[PDB]
Amino acid sequence: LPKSVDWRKKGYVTPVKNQKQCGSAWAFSATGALEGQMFRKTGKLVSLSEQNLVDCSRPQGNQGCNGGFMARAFQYVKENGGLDSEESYPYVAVDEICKYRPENSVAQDTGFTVVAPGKEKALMKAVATVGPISVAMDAGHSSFQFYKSGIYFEPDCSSKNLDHGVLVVGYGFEGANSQNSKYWLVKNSWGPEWGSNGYVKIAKDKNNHCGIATAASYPNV
């Protein structure tokens, strides 16, 4: 596998978005992964509607701003037959009535694939061959809110208690040697000011730090 991967360099990733005061990270993580897969299928990068997911996917088990799951989001897109563009269905960071219109849909999926749980090498292989991957992580620590740069390593991080959904867009390493100071390249949904540019380098191959490889998946397009 490549020593480094960065799907942003290849056109797979939309700009950093901001969920604001709505517990909708699961929706941003799912649209990030579907955006990468729809791009690989069509050559066209089109931002998808988190608000469509927040307002419409309660039947699949999501709870809007009260939380949800990326896999249930991909299940909604499958059952619904489509998912609207963000341009047509803007984000307002509150729970609202579903306004989905098929004429505005720009994405579809047939289900989703789960990465072998707990296995960072399985996630490295999925990232290298598929594109961006949705993942769950433990973001429940003040060090995460205040993160600015460098490889994030939180001693109290859990790989099982996962309260946040984010997007792995790549992996890399700091310094001349490919095997040390390794990290996952993670797109967050807290705006471009958080993390200096909205991304965080999470320690890689350090025992599934913060659970990045515990519950990783991507839509089937």
Partner: peptide, 5 residues
Amino acid sequence: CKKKK
């Protein structure tokens, strides 16, 4: 598991 807010 728990919801991913």
